[PDB]
Design a protein around this ligand. Sequence first.
Ligand SMILES: *[C@@H]1O[C@H](CO)[C@@H](O[C@@H]2O[C@H](CO)[C@@H](O[C@@H]3O[C@H](CO[C@H]4O[C@H](CO)[C@@H](O)[C@H](O)[C@@H]4O[C@@H]4O[C@H](CO)[C@@H](O[C@@H]5O[C@H](CO)[C@H](O)[C@H](O)[C@H]5O)[C@H](O)[C@H]4NC(C)=O)[C@@H](O)[C@H](O[C@H]4O[C@H](CO)[C@@H](O)[C@H](O)[C@@H]4O[C@@H]4O[C@H](CO)[C@@H](O[C@@H]5O[C@H](CO)[C@H](O)[C@H](O)[C@H]5O)[C@H](O)[C@H]4NC(C)=O)[C@@H]3O)[C@H](O)[C@H]2NC(C)=O)[C@H](O)[C@H]1NC(C)=O
Length: 92
Amino acid sequence: APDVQDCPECTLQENPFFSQPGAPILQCMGCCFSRAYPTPLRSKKTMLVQKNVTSESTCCVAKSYNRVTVMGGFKVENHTACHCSTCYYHKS
Ligand SMILES: *[C@@H]1O[C@H](CO)[C@@H](O[C@@H]2O[C@H](CO)[C@@H](O[C@@H]3O[C@H](CO[C@H]4O[C@H](CO)[C@@H](O)[C@H](O)[C@@H]4O[C@@H]4O[C@H](CO)[C@@H](O[C@@H]5O[C@H](CO)[C@H](O)[C@H](O)[C@H]5O)[C@H](O)[C@H]4NC(C)=O)[C@@H](O)[C@H](O[C@H]4O[C@H](CO)[C@@H](O)[C@H](O)[C@@H]4O[C@@H]4O[C@H](CO)[C@@H](O[C@@H]5O[C@H](CO)[C@H](O)[C@H](O)[C@H]5O)[C@H](O)[C@H]4NC(C)=O)[C@@H]3O)[C@H](O)[C@H]2NC(C)=O)[C@H](O)[C@H]1NC(C)=O
């Protein structure tokens, strides 16, 4: 029985606008699973519909973008290297 496509991994959602005959822009999808190494923590503003969107962790911010501002100024940081994790700094 068909339905959906589940939730792959945090990648790039190739710009469905800039996607021209030679330039397939992007904009990091966002679905790097929801692994829970230690005890799941919270408290960071968020406060969004708790519908399977609170457990997930890590964060992906195009490790290396190639931004191609489109439309009225659509930024896709033409993701050249999306990395889901390192959502902060240690030691420091
Ligand atoms: C927004 O951001 C996007 C990315 O997030 C960006 O798009 C991405 O751009 C990247 C480039 O900047 C691109 O990466 C490159 O991919 C090349 C391969 O592309 C093909 O495969 C991929 C993967 O499957 C596919 O997606 C892509 O469409 C290509 O598919 C082929 O396309 C053909 C038409 O173009 C098509 O037609 C023919 O088909 C034939 C039969 O199959 C055959 O394949 C023909 O070749 C082909 O033309 C073909 O069918 C199809 N094939 C398939 C599988 O479908 C890589 O080649 C390229 O690598 C090189 O560059 C990178 C970056 O610099 C280097 O890191 C890497 O090392 C390579 O560098 C050179 O490598 C050669 C290797 O030989 C070196 O040569 C040496 O030569 C010596 C002497 O002979 C000796 O032999 C040595 O051994 C050799 O090494 C050379 O020295 C190296 N140069 C240097 C300087 O070091 C690179 O990885 C990526 O794929 C894009 N991503 C996407 C989603 O498309 C987008 O552009 C951005 N947007 C904007 C607006 O900016």
